[PDB]
């Protein structure tokens, strides 16, 4: 399909970034070629964490999310650092109402359908120019990725519903 406008944005531990890029960038270029995605790495304004942006199709983003998670787990095990590495997703505060639903029922439903635990950063931790919440997903890799697919479906729909009026008028 067409690459979509809203990227998947992950927050990963800085110490695993070198592993994701790999020698002479061959790991990231491999992920890019297998998933047909544009990937970049940058700071998140609000030290031990870095932002990863994946611009792909929905399926390309989900596949890159799984490859990235597998590398981080490989690297956490291989350095005896951790046996789990939670998946952290960045989503604009405007979209997270829809994902959460009334009294968090939509989020419990994703947690139950995917066999994951999900927690969302506090509203009070946003900044004037950083409107992104962090959604922490814990569980097996395959399960975190199913939750990624569900969350990012909801975020993309909320984005397309919010901008539909202003796209028509032009």
Author numbering: 191 to 236, 239 to 362
Authors' description from the paper:
The structure shows that the KH1 and KH2 domains fold into an intra-molecular pseudo-dimer,, an arrangement found in a number of KH and RRM-containing proteins including the IMP1 KH3KH4 di-domain. Within the pseudo-dimer, the domains make contact through the two β1 strands, the inter-domain linker and the C-terminal α-helix of each domain (α3), burying a surface of ∼1200 Å2. Interestingly, many of the amino acids mediating the contacts between the two α3 helices (S254, C257, H265) are conserved in KH1KH2 across species but are very different in KH3KH4. In addition, KH1 α3 is longer than KH3 α3 and the linker between KH1 and KH2 is three amino acids shorter than that between KH3 and KH4, implying that the shorter KH1KH2 linker must span a longer distance to reach the amino-terminus of the second KH domain. In KH1KH2, after a sharp downward turn, the linker assumes a nearly linear conformation retracing the direction of the helix to reach the amino-terminal residue of KH2. The differences in the inter-domain interface result in a change in the angle between the two domains and, as a consequence, in a shorter distance (7–8Å) between the two RNA-binding grooves, as highlighted by the superimposition of the two structures. The structure also shows that the path between the RNA-binding grooves of KH1 and KH2 is positively charged, which may impact on the dynamics of RNA looping as discussed in our model below. A plot of the RDCs measured in solution against those back-calculated from the structure reveals the high correlation (R2 = 0.97) between the two datasets, indicating that the crystal structure is highly representative of the protein conformation in solution.
At the molecular level, IMP1 regulates the transport, translation and stability of a diverse ensemble of messenger RNAs (mRNAs).
